[PDB]
Write a protein that binds this ligand. Structure first.
Ligand SMILES: Nc1ncnc2c1ncn2[C@@H]1O[C@H](CSCC[C@H](N)C(=O)O)[C@@H](O)[C@H]1O
Ligand SMILES: [Mg+2]
Ligand SMILES: [Zn+2]
Ligand SMILES: [Zn+2]
Lengths: 298, 115
């Protein structure tokens, strides 16, 4: 009813509790396009609707914040998603980006190569990714779980994210992984989100909120992807541009959250309580350094 | 004693009748800002549009050296404002005009600094 005036739609709680088997996806409006304002690209409108939805959750925001972004280049040689993120965040925040082919950008610093050659010395407050492999198009057997760059991402999170931060990572019908669903059970809340401007595709973003460092609940990953395909097959959604015309309240808010250093064996029920409600960060506070590996031959 | 000169070369190409450079990056905003030339966040009024800075610089896009003692770039990492009747060639507009150093407006399209 009122759905066409929001920025998008999220997956309801009673669909998460069932036990279904996997089938093929078949959408009623599979090939349609939407009507955009006079001079605007499809990739600028998609990133604006995702930041409007994150304004309704309980994120942490300290003095001197740190952010990193994977898969950032286009087939024409520039970077439209990096320019929307710099408009949203507070003045003085530090930002770094990366990809496999060459391009030019507005960030503070940039690196070129395959994602498995990157290393850093410090820890981070928020993480974003849009990667996708072209030979996934060439379908010739049953639909099973995939590896590749998904194996690098699971290990970076367990080793370099601060207690109290957040993430968002992109998927489709044939591009997915079973150990990433199992790790959503180590945060305080989770979901999956679809934008109103690309509603005729099987794409979505997977989101985790306030990190704790051990399991709260047990989850089987093969069963939970079959529950996601059953919701999309029985509930159709209609294309819309309404929310792009009102920008009087876009920028993110300034809470001044606190930061400490602590050692295992000083974690109380008191302490865990504050992490869950969005009001404490735990890490070191020195200074930032990065690099990339090179092979020599012939 | 020899060196390349690309700034004179785009001018001669345009006068003979070639098509201008495309794919510059445009943003969404309210149109009730202050109107100055180069800023830290978008500031257009009811007679202008706003763009991302690196994609409008001739040296960044051609892959060449910046003409400076310390090769320093004035646009990368900020936002720039352009008048609506000239918005089909943003690269050429910035090469040809100059900024006033006391009020911050473009000379000829905003500076009123004489009674
Ligand atoms: N193994 C890999 N390592 C690094 N980058 C990869 C990769 N597999 C895919 N990519 C990159 O993933 C990108 C998705 S293409 C579209 C990205 C979008 N224009 C954006 O604004 O981010 C491609 O440019 C591709 O180069
Ligand atoms: Mg589409
Ligand atoms: Zn430049
Ligand atoms: Zn003046």
């Amino acid at each position: 009813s009122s759905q066409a005036w929001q920025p998008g739609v999220a997956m309801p709680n009673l669909y998460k509790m069932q036990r279904m088997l996997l089938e093929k996806c078949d959408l009623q409006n599979y090939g349609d396009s939407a009507t955009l304002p006079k001079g605007i690209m499809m990739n600028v409108a998609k990133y604006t609707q995702l930041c409007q939805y994150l304004n309704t959750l309980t994120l942490a925001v300290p003095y001197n914040m740190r952010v990193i972004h994977f898969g950032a280049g286009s087939d024409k040689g520039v970077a439209p998603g990096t320019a929307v993120l710099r408009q949203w965040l507070p003045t003085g925040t530090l930002l770094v980006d990366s990809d496999l082919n060459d391009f030019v950008s507005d960030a503070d610093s940039t690196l070129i190569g395959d994602c498995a050659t990157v290393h850093t010395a410090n820890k981070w407050d928020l993480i974003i990714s849009d990667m996708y492999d072209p030979k996934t198009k060439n379908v010739t057997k049953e639909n099973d779980s995939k590896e590749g760059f998904f194996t690098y991402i699971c290990g970076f999170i367990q080793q370099k994210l601060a207690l109290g931060g957040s993430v968002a990572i992109k998927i489709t019908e044939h591009s997915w992984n079973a150990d990433l669903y199992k790790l959503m059970g180590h945060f305080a809340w989770w979901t999956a989100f679809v934008t109103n401007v690309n509603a005729s595709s099987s794409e979505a973003f997977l989101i985790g909120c306030n990190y704790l460092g051990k399991p709260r609940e047990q989850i089987d990953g093969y069963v939970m992807h079959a529950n996601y395909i059953f919701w999309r097959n029985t509930n159709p959604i209609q294309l819309s541009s309404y929310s792009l015309f009102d920008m009087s309240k876009f920028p993110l808010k300034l809470r001044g959250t606190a930061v400490m250093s602590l050692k295992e064996g000083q974690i109380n029920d008191m302490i865990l309580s504050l992490l869950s409600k969005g009001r404490l960060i735990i890490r070191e506070n020195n200074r930032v350094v990065i690099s990339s590996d090179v092979l020599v031959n012939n | 004693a020899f060196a390349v000169d690309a700034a004179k070369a785009y001018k001669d190409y345009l006068a003979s009748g070639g098509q201008p450079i495309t794919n510059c990056v445009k943003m969404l905003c309210t149109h009730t800002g202050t109107g100055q030339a180069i800023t830290v966040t978008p500031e257009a009024n009811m007679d202008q549009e706003s763009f991302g800075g690196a994609s409008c610089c001739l040296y960044c896009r051609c892959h060449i050296d910046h003409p400076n003692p310390k090769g320093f770039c004035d646009l990368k990492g900020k936002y720039v404002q352009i008048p609506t009747t000239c918005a089909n060639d943003p690269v050429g507009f910035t090469l040809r005009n100059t900024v006033c150093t006391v009020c911050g407006m473009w000379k000829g399209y905003g500076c009123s600094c004489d009674q």
